[PDB]
Design an enzyme around this catalytic site. Structure first.
Site, PDB file in Angstrom:
ATOM      1  N   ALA A   1       9.249  -5.825   0.983  1.00 30.29           N
ATOM      2  CA  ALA A   1      10.003  -4.653   1.399  1.00 30.29           C
ATOM      3  C   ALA A   1       9.642  -4.278   2.868  1.00 30.29           C
ATOM      4  CB  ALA A   1       9.712  -3.495   0.464  1.00 30.29           C
TER       5      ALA A   1
ATOM      6  N   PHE B   1      11.424  -5.319   5.507  1.00 32.15           N
ATOM      7  CA  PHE B   1      11.910  -6.356   6.401  1.00 32.15           C
ATOM      8  C   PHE B   1      13.391  -6.040   6.623  1.00 32.15           C
ATOM      9  CE2 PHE B   1      12.447 -10.519   8.234  1.00 32.15           C
ATOM     10  CZ  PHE B   1      11.193 -10.763   8.756  1.00 32.15           C
TER      11      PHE B   1
ATOM     12  N   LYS C   1      15.202  -3.395   5.538  1.00 33.37           N
ATOM     13  CA  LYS C   1      15.192  -2.016   5.004  1.00 33.37           C
ATOM     14  C   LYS C   1      16.596  -1.560   4.522  1.00 33.37           C
ATOM     15  CE  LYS C   1      11.024  -0.311   7.457  1.00 33.37           C
ATOM     16  NZ  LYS C   1      10.358   0.658   6.510  1.00 33.37           N
TER      17      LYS C   1
ATOM     18  N   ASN D   1       1.757  -0.571  11.735  1.00 31.17           N
ATOM     19  CA  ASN D   1       3.043   0.105  11.811  1.00 31.17           C
ATOM     20  C   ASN D   1       2.953   1.531  11.324  1.00 31.17           C
ATOM     21  OD1 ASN D   1       4.700   0.551   9.033  1.00 31.17           O
ATOM     22  ND2 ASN D   1       3.398  -1.232   8.763  1.00 31.17           N
TER      23      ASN D   1
ATOM     24  N   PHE E   1       9.431   5.210   6.871  1.00 27.34           N
ATOM     25  CA  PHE E   1      10.627   4.985   6.018  1.00 27.34           C
ATOM     26  C   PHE E   1      11.937   5.179   6.784  1.00 27.34           C
ATOM     27  CE2 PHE E   1       8.319   3.892   2.398  1.00 27.34           C
ATOM     28  CZ  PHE E   1       7.961   4.859   1.483  1.00 27.34           C
TER      29      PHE E   1
ATOM     30  N   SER F   1       3.055   3.816   0.741  1.00 26.34           N
ATOM     31  CA  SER F   1       3.197   3.835   2.193  1.00 26.34           C
ATOM     32  C   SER F   1       2.141   4.747   2.767  1.00 26.34           C
ATOM     33  CB  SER F   1       4.552   4.370   2.638  1.00 26.34           C
ATOM     34  OG  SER F   1       4.597   4.446   4.058  1.00 26.34           O
TER      35      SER F   1
ATOM     36  N   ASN G   1       2.379   5.865   5.807  1.00 21.10           N
ATOM     37  CA  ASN G   1       3.126   6.542   6.874  1.00 21.10           C
ATOM     38  C   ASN G   1       4.025   7.711   6.429  1.00 21.10           C
ATOM     39  OD1 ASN G   1       1.917   4.580   8.565  1.00 21.10           O
ATOM     40  ND2 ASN G   1       3.519   3.134   8.024  1.00 21.10           N
ATOM     41  N   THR G   2       4.001   8.099   5.145  1.00 20.30           N
ATOM     42  CA  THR G   2       4.728   9.288   4.698  1.00 20.30           C
ATOM     43  C   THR G   2       3.669  10.199   4.086  1.00 20.30           C
ATOM     44  OG1 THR G   2       6.820   8.124   4.315  1.00 20.30           O
ATOM     45  CG2 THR G   2       6.562  10.247   3.215  1.00 20.30           C
TER      46      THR G   2
ATOM     47  N   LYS H   1       4.421  -0.493  -6.426  1.00 22.90           N
ATOM     48  CA  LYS H   1       3.677  -1.031  -5.295  1.00 22.90           C
ATOM     49  C   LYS H   1       2.505  -0.094  -5.006  1.00 22.90           C
ATOM     50  CE  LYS H   1       4.163  -3.457  -0.929  1.00 22.90           C
ATOM     51  NZ  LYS H   1       5.120  -3.707   0.189  1.00 22.90           N
TER      52      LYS H   1
ATOM     53  N   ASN I   1       0.235  -2.889  -0.680  1.00 22.73           N
ATOM     54  CA  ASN I   1       0.820  -2.409   0.553  1.00 22.73           C
ATOM     55  C   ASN I   1      -0.220  -2.575   1.692  1.00 22.73           C
ATOM     56  OD1 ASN I   1       2.578  -0.915   2.365  1.00 22.73           O
ATOM     57  ND2 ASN I   1       3.362   0.081   0.539  1.00 22.73           N
ATOM     58  N   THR I   2       0.060  -2.004   2.855  1.00 26.80           N
ATOM     59  CA  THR I   2      -0.817  -2.058   4.015  1.00 26.80           C
ATOM     60  C   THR I   2      -2.063  -1.198   3.787  1.00 26.80           C
ATOM     61  OG1 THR I   2       0.470  -0.304   5.105  1.00 26.80           O
ATOM     62  CG2 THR I   2       1.046  -2.549   5.691  1.00 26.80           C
TER      63      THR I   2
ATOM     64  N   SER J   1      -1.300  -4.987   8.292  1.00 26.88           N
ATOM     65  CA  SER J   1      -0.762  -6.145   7.564  1.00 26.88           C
ATOM     66  C   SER J   1      -1.287  -7.397   8.240  1.00 26.88           C
ATOM     67  CB  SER J   1       0.755  -6.202   7.733  1.00 26.88           C
ATOM     68  OG  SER J   1       1.423  -5.028   7.325  1.00 26.88           O
ATOM     69  N   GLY J   2      -1.108  -8.536   7.582  1.00 32.34           N
ATOM     70  CA  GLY J   2      -1.475  -9.819   8.154  1.00 32.34           C
ATOM     71  C   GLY J   2      -2.733 -10.413   7.603  1.00 32.34           C
TER      72      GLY J   2
HETATM   73  C1  FMN Z   1       6.914  -2.990   9.996  1.00 27.59           C
HETATM   74  C2  FMN Z   1       6.548  -2.922   8.536  1.00 27.59           C
HETATM   75  C3  FMN Z   1       7.307  -2.127   7.679  1.00 27.59           C
HETATM   76  C4  FMN Z   1       7.028  -2.053   6.312  1.00 27.59           C
HETATM   77  N1  FMN Z   1       7.886  -1.305   5.481  1.00 27.59           N
HETATM   78  C5  FMN Z   1       7.647  -1.331   4.185  1.00 27.59           C
HETATM   79  C6  FMN Z   1       8.565  -0.598   3.283  1.00 27.59           C
HETATM   80  O1  FMN Z   1       9.586   0.001   3.608  1.00 27.59           O
HETATM   81  N2  FMN Z   1       8.191  -0.659   1.944  1.00 27.59           N
HETATM   82  C7  FMN Z   1       7.100  -1.354   1.431  1.00 27.59           C
HETATM   83  O2  FMN Z   1       6.891  -1.357   0.218  1.00 27.59           O
HETATM   84  N3  FMN Z   1       6.282  -2.046   2.267  1.00 27.59           N
HETATM   85  C8  FMN Z   1       6.532  -2.039   3.571  1.00 27.59           C
HETATM   86  N4  FMN Z   1       5.713  -2.757   4.396  1.00 27.59           N
HETATM   87  C9  FMN Z   1       4.598  -3.500   3.787  1.00 27.59           C
HETATM   88  C10 FMN Z   1       4.974  -4.948   3.477  1.00 27.59           C
HETATM   89  O3  FMN Z   1       5.992  -5.015   2.473  1.00 27.59           O
HETATM   90  C11 FMN Z   1       3.736  -5.724   3.030  1.00 27.59           C
HETATM   91  O4  FMN Z   1       3.311  -5.136   1.807  1.00 27.59           O
HETATM   92  C12 FMN Z   1       2.591  -5.696   4.046  1.00 27.59           C
HETATM   93  O5  FMN Z   1       3.077  -5.915   5.376  1.00 27.59           O
HETATM   94  C13 FMN Z   1       1.435  -6.609   3.690  1.00 27.59           C
HETATM   95  O6  FMN Z   1       1.870  -7.985   3.651  1.00 27.59           O
HETATM   96  P1  FMN Z   1       1.763  -8.981   4.942  1.00 27.59           P
HETATM   97  O7  FMN Z   1       0.282  -9.121   5.251  1.00 27.59           O
HETATM   98  O8  FMN Z   1       2.262 -10.342   4.435  1.00 27.59           O
HETATM   99  O9  FMN Z   1       2.540  -8.458   6.139  1.00 27.59           O
HETATM  100  C14 FMN Z   1       5.942  -2.794   5.796  1.00 27.59           C
HETATM  101  C15 FMN Z   1       5.171  -3.582   6.652  1.00 27.59           C
HETATM  102  C16 FMN Z   1       5.461  -3.663   8.012  1.00 27.59           C
HETATM  103  C17 FMN Z   1       4.607  -4.543   8.893  1.00 27.59           C
HETATM  104  C1  F1T Z   2       8.502 -11.700  17.183  1.00 29.24           C
HETATM  105  C2  F1T Z   2       8.512 -10.622  16.152  1.00 29.24           C
HETATM  106  N1  F1T Z   2       9.331 -10.785  15.109  1.00 29.24           N
HETATM  107  C3  F1T Z   2       9.473  -9.773  14.237  1.00 29.24           C
HETATM  108  N2  F1T Z   2      10.434  -9.866  13.273  1.00 29.24           N
HETATM  109  C4  F1T Z   2      11.112 -10.965  12.706  1.00 29.24           C
HETATM  110  C5  F1T Z   2      10.664 -12.279  12.833  1.00 29.24           C
HETATM  111  C6  F1T Z   2      11.371 -13.315  12.247  1.00 29.24           C
HETATM  112  C7  F1T Z   2      12.544 -13.070  11.540  1.00 29.24           C
HETATM  113  C8  F1T Z   2      13.355 -14.199  10.985  1.00 29.24           C
HETATM  114  F1  F1T Z   2      12.624 -15.045  10.257  1.00 29.24           F
HETATM  115  F2  F1T Z   2      13.954 -14.924  11.944  1.00 29.24           F
HETATM  116  F3  F1T Z   2      14.333 -13.784  10.176  1.00 29.24           F
HETATM  117  C9  F1T Z   2      12.968 -11.753  11.395  1.00 29.24           C
HETATM  118  C10 F1T Z   2      12.248 -10.707  11.946  1.00 29.24           C
HETATM  119  C11 F1T Z   2       8.662  -8.604  14.281  1.00 29.24           C
HETATM  120  C12 F1T Z   2       8.307  -7.407  13.582  1.00 29.24           C
HETATM  121  C13 F1T Z   2       8.719  -6.933  12.224  1.00 29.24           C
HETATM  122  N3  F1T Z   2       7.407  -6.743  14.254  1.00 29.24           N
HETATM  123  O1  F1T Z   2       7.120  -7.519  15.423  1.00 29.24           O
HETATM  124  C14 F1T Z   2       7.857  -8.630  15.437  1.00 29.24           C
HETATM  125  N4  F1T Z   2       7.750  -9.547  16.381  1.00 29.24           N
HETATM  126  O1  ORO Z   3       8.058   2.777   6.573  1.00 25.90           O
HETATM  127  C1  ORO Z   3       6.861   2.526   6.689  1.00 25.90           C
HETATM  128  O2  ORO Z   3       6.209   2.833   7.753  1.00 25.90           O
HETATM  129  C2  ORO Z   3       6.132   1.638   5.745  1.00 25.90           C
HETATM  130  C3  ORO Z   3       6.349   1.666   4.403  1.00 25.90           C
HETATM  131  C4  ORO Z   3       5.408   1.041   3.521  1.00 25.90           C
HETATM  132  O3  ORO Z   3       5.433   1.118   2.300  1.00 25.90           O
HETATM  133  N1  ORO Z   3       4.332   0.407   4.132  1.00 25.90           N
HETATM  134  C5  ORO Z   3       4.082   0.375   5.487  1.00 25.90           C
HETATM  135  O4  ORO Z   3       3.048  -0.096   5.959  1.00 25.90           O
HETATM  136  N2  ORO Z   3       5.019   0.992   6.273  1.00 25.90           N
END
Ligand code: FMN
Ligand code: F1T
Ligand code: ORO
Length: 371
Positions: A64, A66, A68, A113, A117, A184, A186-187, A233, A262-263, A281-282
């Site tokens: 989620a 990605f 939105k 981030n 939302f 989240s 962030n809320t 989540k 989540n993060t 994240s990451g």
């Molecule tokens: C820019 C951004 C926005 C996110 N928005 C949401 C969201 O709307 N809802 C949610 O459940 N998680 C959200 N997440 C959390 C991701 O779904 C995921 O749980 C998190 O990034 C950890 O996984 P990763 O290490 O593979 O990035 C967001 C993360 C990022 C980086």
């Molecule tokens: C360079 C880069 N790419 C981002 N997003 C992103 C990357 C790949 C794809 C794709 F697989 F092509 F569909 C879609 C979105 C983010 C985000 C989120 N934050 O910093 C980013 N910085």
């Molecule tokens: O919208 C957000 O900032 C968001 C939602 C969520 O569930 N997790 C996160 O790290 N960001």
């Protein structure tokens, strides 16, 4: 096709000179006009997986936040993903917290981030999902692909259940599963809803609303053609007492699965993020996150299916999560640092590992770290 050397030069450039949220909205716009590469690969019958009746063609989905707004469902899935979780959506649309609110550290493969939302609101996103579901009827290529919907509350909403009920009543019908977002960072103060008593009422209210879609109102315009499954989540920033109390609630309320996790707000050692606010994240989230899967997989006595997130980049990362107790994996940060090649590559690394580790299929690897 998604492994074309051209995309990798473009991403490495985007990562160095362009703002994160601009890159993301640009790549979503590219997908909106179907200009992104396709995955031709026929996924391994040995890497297939499930959560109840949810039949995943491969073990990898998009987390989620990605897509939105569900504007890019077709394109993202076509990169080689079995599923996608759209949203988090809120009843009314939101612009989110102040920009810039997305930051990267390429060396640590980490993201921070404070989005808050940001989304078009339940009603516009439902319109966006209805369009995909009508496209899915015509396109046999997307027939088996799954779409989940993450639901939350608007910033100013006093009672979260009101917002969760609103979202179910509008988008429930078109979802294969609903993910309750109580994690989240962030809320303010969404995470309080993870307290056992509040969580129990949230789960039972969400489930009561989905169950009522039948009585209140052909009806299932989704992949499964069944009422959506309910996932929750969770945040990694909880103590052991909290994790246990939650685990008991999940067992009693019979949640169909749990998204771990989540993060985190507990990472202090990223130097570029010292002046930054939000959730991390990451790569830095991986160990925290996999430990949380082991913990919950045991607290729930292996009764609740697990959706892994995050820190997943390699096949070794995905196997670690599966052996910890997860059935499927979700990627986010991987698509940011690895790009379009993410799905095709990770599916390969995993298949190689499943053979190497002497597993007949992925289903045999689930929770195998725990005797
Ligand atoms: C820019 C951004 C926005 C996110 N928005 C949401 C969201 O709307 N809802 C949610 O459940 N998680 C959200 N997440 C959390 C991701 O779904 C995921 O749980 C998190 O990034 C950890 O996984 P990763 O290490 O593979 O990035 C967001 C993360 C990022 C980086
Ligand atoms: C360079 C880069 N790419 C981002 N997003 C992103 C990357 C790949 C794809 C794709 F697989 F092509 F569909 C879609 C979105 C983010 C985000 C989120 N934050 O910093 C980013 N910085
Ligand atoms: O919208 C957000 O900032 C968001 C939602 C969520 O569930 N997790 C996160 O790290 N960001």
């Amino acid at each position: 096709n998604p492994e074309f050397f051209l995309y990798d030069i473009f991403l490495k450039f985007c990562l160095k000179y362009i703002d994160g949220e601009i890159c993301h909205d640009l790549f979503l716009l590219l997908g909106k006009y179907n200009i992104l590469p396709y995955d031709t690969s026929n996924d391994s019958i040995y890497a297939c997986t499930n959560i109840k009746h949810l039949d995943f063609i491969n073990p990898f989905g998009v987390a989620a936040g990605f897509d939105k707004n569900g504007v890019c469902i077709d394109s993202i899935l076509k990169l080689g993903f079995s599923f996608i979780e759209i949203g988090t959506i809120t009843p009314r649309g939101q612009t989110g917290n102040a920009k810039p609110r997305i930051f990267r550290d390429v060396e640590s493969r980490s993201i921070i981030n404070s989005c808050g939302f940001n989304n078009m609101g339940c009603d516009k996103v439902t319109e966006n999902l209805i369009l995909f579901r009508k496209r899915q009827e015509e396109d046999k290529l997307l027939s088996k692909h799954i779409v989940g919907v993450s639901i939350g509350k608007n910033k100013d909403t006093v009672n979260i259940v009101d917002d969760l009920k609103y979202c179910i009543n509008k988008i429930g019908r078109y979802a294969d599963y609903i993910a309750i977002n109580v994690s989240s960072p962030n809320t303010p103060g969404l995470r309080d809803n993870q307290e056992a008593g509040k969580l129990k009422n949230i789960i039972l209210s969400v489930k009561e609303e989905i169950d009522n879609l039948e009585k209140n109102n052909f009806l299932w315009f989704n992949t499964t053609k069944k009422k959506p499954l309910v996932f929750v989540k969770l945040a990694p920033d909880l103590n052991q007492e909290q994790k246990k109390e939650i685990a008991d609630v999940l067992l009693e309320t019979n949640i169909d699965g749990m998204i771990i996790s989540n993060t985190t707000t507990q990472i202090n050692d990223i130097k570029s993020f010292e002046n930054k606010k939000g959730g991390v994240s990451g790569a830095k989230l991986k160990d925290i996150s996999t430990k949380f899967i082991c913990e919950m997989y045991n607290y729930t006595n292996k009764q609740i299916p697990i959706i892994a997130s995050g820190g997943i980049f390699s096949g070794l990362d995905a196997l670690e999560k599966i052996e910890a107790g997860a059935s499927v994996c979700q990627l986010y940060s991987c698509l940011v640092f690895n790009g379009m090649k993410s799905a095709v590559q990770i599916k390969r690394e995993l298949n190689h590992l499943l053979y190497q580790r002497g597993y007949y299929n992925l289903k045999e690897a689930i929770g195998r770290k725990h005797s």
